[PDB]
């Protein structure tokens, strides 16, 4: 890769600079380069990787939704479909890149609960983003790949992490969104969000003020969804 000649520490430093500059494509390329050095990532480095690609794919998802909406209205020349396909293909390429990094070899080297659950959640997330645009022969298989990754992450997180752990909470949040938006399972989504919220509420008393702030931030997202969904 084009980052093969740059020091790992320099790539991490430049990822942080790119974040400050809101240059998320650069940030993602720097963190991809850091991953490809082959060493495991620290907690801070995993978060940089996630921030970078979440922002890149988030712009593509927003664009895809705009174009898909225009396309569906046009069906109530080929240019709208063509351009939606272009954005869709670029989005799929970003998801494939992230999934490739997780498979080669972040997940298999991740032994601690925090890293392994973080990466398996990411795997669920990027299969979920693929699922949002999928439409034939493979939508079902993409959905089940997302489900499988989320489920393995859930199983580990419930055995190894406290109910207020922000990674565990963000995982449960995203799996509940998977149920509601992708898998046509709104009741599963609501049940998961409710149980997750209530079990976290009962564990808040164990936390410092700073940990309590981290946990309650994600709990509020669970509550916001329950308010939208019920």
């Amino acid at each position: 890769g084009a980052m093969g000649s740059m020091e790992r520490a320099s790539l991490i430093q430049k990822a942080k600079l790119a974040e400050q500059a809101e240059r998320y494509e650069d940030m993602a390329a720097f963190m991809k380069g850091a991953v490809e050095k082959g060493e495991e990532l620290s907690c801070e480095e995993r978060n940089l990787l996630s921030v970078a690609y979440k922002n890149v794919v988030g712009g593509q998802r927003a664009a895809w939704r705009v174009l898909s909406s225009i396309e569906q209205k046009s069906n109530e020349g080929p240019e709208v479909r063509e351009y939606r396909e272009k954005v869709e293909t670029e989005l799929q390429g970003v998801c494939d890149t992230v999934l490739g990094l997780l498979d080669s070899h972040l997940i298999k080297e991740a032994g601690d609960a925090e890293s392994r659950v973080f990466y398996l959640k990411m795997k669920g997330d990027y299969y979920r983003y693929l699922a949002e645009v999928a439409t034939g022969d493979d939508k079902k298989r993409i959905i089940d790949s997302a489900r499988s990754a989320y489920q393995e992450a859930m199983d580990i997180s419930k055995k190894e992490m406290p109910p207020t752990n922000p990674i565990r909470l963000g995982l449960a949040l995203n799996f509940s969104v998977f149920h509601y938006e992708i898998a046509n399972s709104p009741e599963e989504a609501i049940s998961l969000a409710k149980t997750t919220f209530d079990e976290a509420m009962a564990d808040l008393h164990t936390l410092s003020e700073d940990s309590y702030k981290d946990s309650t931030l994600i709990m509020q997202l669970l509550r916001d969804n329950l308010t939208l969904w019920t």
Partner: peptide
């Protein structure tokens, strides 16, 4: 629906 922030402690 709201999904998780990227950065998680």
């Amino acid at each position: 629906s709201h999904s998780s922030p990227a950065s998680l402690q």
